[PDB]
Design a binder for these strands. Structure first.
Ligand SMILES: [Zn+2]
Ligand SMILES: [Zn+2]
Ligand SMILES: [Zn+2]
Length: 81
DNA sequence: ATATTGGTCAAGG
DNA sequence: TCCTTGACCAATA
């Protein structure tokens, strides 16, 4: 059948889209990255985020790998300024 | 301009 | 039939 969001009243034809959407109300983020503190509500978002980890540049303080050097540079300023 | 991300949507495996 | 997957678009911590 169909289902409706208990928080905002939005109706969903695909019930799995409600499961993901509801997490935007509850703050639930069950998909956690093993290579950084990233956490998301949608499994395929973690798959996408993983491409940013890995050719590969590695932070020499926290050992975190990065595919794009500029993303590593931003990681330096945020965690090791 | 770029890289990355949250919310959205549904094709198709 | 239905959940997984990933493309699309707008926003940027
Ligand atoms: Zn809602
Ligand atoms: Zn990560
Ligand atoms: Zn680091």
């Amino acid at each position: 059948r169909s289902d409706t969001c208990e928080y905002c009243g939005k109706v969903f034809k695909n019930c799995s889209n409600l499961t993901v959407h509801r997490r935007s109300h509850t703050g639930e983020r069950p998909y956690k990255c093993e290579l950084c503190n990233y956490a998301c509500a949608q499994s395929s978002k973690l798959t996408r985020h993983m491409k940013t980890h890995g050719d590969v540049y590695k932070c020499e303080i926290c050992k975190m790998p990065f595919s794009v050097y500029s993303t590593l540079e931003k990681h330096m300023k945020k965690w090791h300024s």
